[PDB]
Symmetry: D2
């Protein structure tokens, strides 16, 4: 129920091998590690979680954009791109978090569907 | 080799039933109709053309955003969103033209792959 | 009542010396030249028109993105970026058309105020 | 040396009265409060800091997008929009952090000039 997709606006391509870390806000207001992975050759990261594990909560998806750009010889502006949202608070949903990256800019959107 | 994908930034959803018209610049510098269709329930429009038909040229993809918004009770800013590009000028490629729509804004990107 | 602003998402800067052409849709559906200029050091193009001249109608703002990227030695995707809209007298009076440019992408918005 | 600008992609307008908090990363990796304010009628927040105070380091700009949409009676996706970056003295001296807001999306860019 959670997929992350990352595109490169410079190359016109998927952003491949981008590290993504997901956190969930705990009862004591700290960000607890929830899941992590890397985008594939399609720019997509699947398999982060399961419908059982992905309970209601506040989640942070951190996309490690700086590491991505530095490898292309670009010293970029941002440290990362973070997307913070409440999930599943009206019951289970499927979420795609998409990010379109440039060295000094990004755009992010969510596509939320009800299975 | 040509796919168009349209997302709605207000609803967090695919933009469904969006009309798309594709034109190709003719030898006399006019825009000739090339293909057309509507996005599906996934926001995607497939099957516009074939690799044989999609020769080198300058193409315009016109996405009829105004008609889309007016149906949601939004009087939007733009008449349409147009994407104009040279295709296949170094040999055949596959193109995804993506657009993320808001009433007064859109973002568009291309993902170009070599089969 | 019309300003155009262009920004560069690769360099994090205004997009300077970008050609901008504005057209008005004529009664026969062709695009007639209306205004043009080049963005300034701030990425802005002011003074395109006046309140008297900028009557209701459909306008097109064409931004020459391809020449901008080529001058930087970067290969771009689009031929240009086009923004097509209706000017409406019942709305607010001042229009800013902004474009944020990347080689294979652009974002555009309108800021319409009184 | 730091300005924050926020725009509304639904209404085509500045995003007015949006709370903005700026933090500086401390030596122990926590975020210490640095500056805050509310965007003006132009969607801009000026006067957050001074050249003397704005030393090299990692900063976070947090924009309270959820309250903005809620005030408009619109249900949004994000809790807030965060922009995290390093201030660098070898670059140009003035930073504009801009955010273009929609209920389920935002675009952000940096314009860094001398
Ligand atoms: O499958 C997607 C694609 Br192709 C592009 C985008 C996109 C993200 C930001 C701006 C424009 C398009 C999003 C998704 Br989902
Ligand atoms: O002064 C502006 C800045 Br700085 C950024 C934008 C902007 C445009 C498109 C996407 C994100 C920000 C618009 C304006 Br007027």
């Amino acid at each position: 129920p959670l997929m992350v997709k990352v595109l490169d606006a410079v190359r016109g391509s998927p952003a491949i091998n981008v590290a993504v870390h997901v956190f969930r806000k705990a009862a004591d207001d700290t960000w607890e590690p929830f899941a992590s992975g890397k985008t594939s050759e399609s720019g997509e990261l699947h398999g982060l979680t399961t419908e059982e594990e992905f309970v209601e909560g506040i989640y942070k998806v951190e996309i490690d954009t700086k590491s991505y750009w530095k490898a292309l010889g670009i010293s970029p502006f941002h440290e990362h791109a973070e997307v913070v949202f409440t999930a599943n608070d009206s019951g289970p949903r499927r979420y795609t978090i998409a990010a379109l990256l440039s060295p000094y800019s990004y755009s992010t959107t969510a596509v939320v569907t009800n299975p």
